[PDB]
């Protein structure tokens, strides 16, 4: 009852490692073993669709845009924290990337179950995540930089 | 049912800001508003005693050593993750500090209640926290750099 998720850099198309998912009594733990990411904090969320392909919007290309918006099974239409209920269930703690571009700090999502994640996608943004739609939408994560489909 | 914790740099004796504690259905959230910390990830745990004073050990001074060891109400005598039960209940997610020395990323501790924290101390280390006693004890947090007593 743990799954392996292969993550790919959306810009380069190359693998950046994997993320292992596990279920415990307090929620789902995401344990990253990634590399080649920019140091700092990055938005980290489950997205709705099971794809990492691009999408299009007003004539411009959206890397990993086919993955849809944030997982939001309760139709909240709001971005928030991992421990608040009236926002996307997909909202995870932000992912920390070391000066050496590695991401190994595991994080917990108390509102998710492992069973419901199958078929969705894990997204790593460029920006961080202040867990609010202000001053920028979706926690200010901005562009999608790494993505993997949960199988 | 939120408390304010004033945090002090143990080396300089000066204030570094505060941490607000809150209780929700998923555990206790620590929301930092700190500054003047080294960038990177730092060990972050509740310690047993209600003091931030120094201690002594084999003739050398331990900054914030009077706060005791990690909060460990189940007598596990092991350092682990915030979502694993056979380790110190005091074990929190690591605290992220920006390049500008600020700490504002909130973290959740699903195993703690607000009521039980009164009288203990919040500790911020120098090192990080791999949530293991290997290869270094207590997640490799090492020296204590900032501390505050929960009132
Ligand atoms: Cu996202
Ligand atoms: Cu500690
Ligand atoms: Zn969201
Ligand atoms: Zn510990």
From Swiss-Prot, chains A, B:
CDD domains: Cu-Zn_Superoxide_Dismutase. Binds 1 copper ion per subunit. Disulfide bonds join 52-147. GO terms for cellular component: periplasmic space. Keywords: Antioxidant, Copper, Disulfide bond, Metal-binding, Oxidoreductase, Periplasm, Signal, Zinc. Belongs to the Cu-Zn superoxide dismutase family. This is Superoxide dismutase [Cu-Zn].
């Amino acid at each position: 009852q743990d799954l392996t998720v292969k993550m790919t850099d959306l810009q380069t198309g190359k693998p950046v490692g994997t993320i292992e998912l596990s279920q415990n009594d307090y929620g789902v733990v995401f344990i990253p073993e990634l590399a080649d990411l920019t140091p700092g904090m990055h938005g980290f969320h489950i997205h709705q669709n099971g794809s990492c392909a691009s999408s299009e919007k007003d004539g411009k290309v959206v890397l990993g845009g086919a993955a849809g918006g944030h997982y939001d099974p309760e139709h909240t239409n709001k971005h928030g924290f991992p421990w608040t209920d009236d926002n996307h269930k997909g909202d995870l703690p932000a992912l920390f990337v070391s000066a050496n571009g590695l991401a190994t700090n595991p994080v917990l999502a108390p509102r998710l179950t492992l069973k419901e994640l199958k078929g969705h996608a894990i997204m790593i943004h460029a920006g961080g995540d202040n867990h609010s739609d202000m001053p920028k939408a979706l926690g200010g994560g901005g562009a999608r930089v790494a993505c993997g489909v949960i199988q």
